[model samples]
Target chain A: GIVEQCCTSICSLYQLENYCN
Target chain B: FVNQHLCGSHLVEALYLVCGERGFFYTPKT
Candidate 1:
């Protein structure tokens, strides 16, 4: 759930791969 | 759906707290 929150939040401004890993 | 669920809500305000202070073009260092 934290991944979904923080990762998705990061996704809003940056490429998902940049932070989703 | 992403926009409506996260960006359109107080998360924008919340992000404004983080990003606004840091920089508009910031990306998190995950």
Candidate 2:
């Protein structure tokens, strides 16, 4: 899944403050 | 493909922005 791939990468890249907010 | 296919479990439509029940809803991040 492209979305999943990008999300995983982007979120991991900025998960410092990323979530269901 | 419709959003259901493009996004769906794919995180509510790609970036997980579009949400809600049978529609759309977005809440700003505080």
Candidate 3:
């Protein structure tokens, strides 16, 4: 479950960094 | 269906909360 949460958070972080933020 | 189920809901919401300008492009349901 910890890995899953890390994945989701990192995914969101990068998606924002790369595209939006 | 299994992938959809496995992805979970609140986690999606958590991601959505942080990364949501993408939602400016939501698909029309109908």
DockQ, per-model, please? 0.11, 0.08, 0.07
Highest lDDT: give the candidate number: 1
Cα displacement (Å) at residue B8, model 2: 17
In CAPRI terms, where does candidate 2 land? incorrect
- Per-residue accuracy of model 1 over A1-21 as CA lDDT, tens digit each: 323554454434443222222
The parts of candidate 1 lying over 4 Å away from their true place are A1-3, A6-21, B1-8, B21-30
lDDT at position A16, candidate 2: 18
Model 3 clashing-pair count: 0
Predicted model 2 interface RMSD: 10.0
Which sections of candidate 2 miss by over 4 Å? A1-21, B1-21
What does candidate 2's lDDT look like per residue over A1-21, in tens digits? 334533333323232113334
Per residue, candidate 2 scores C-alpha lDDT tens digits across B1-30 of 222323235444433442223343333222
Chain A in model 3: its TM-score? 0.23
Better of 1 and 2 by DockQ: 1
User: What are the chain B TM-scores of all models?
Assistant: 0.31, 0.18, 0.39
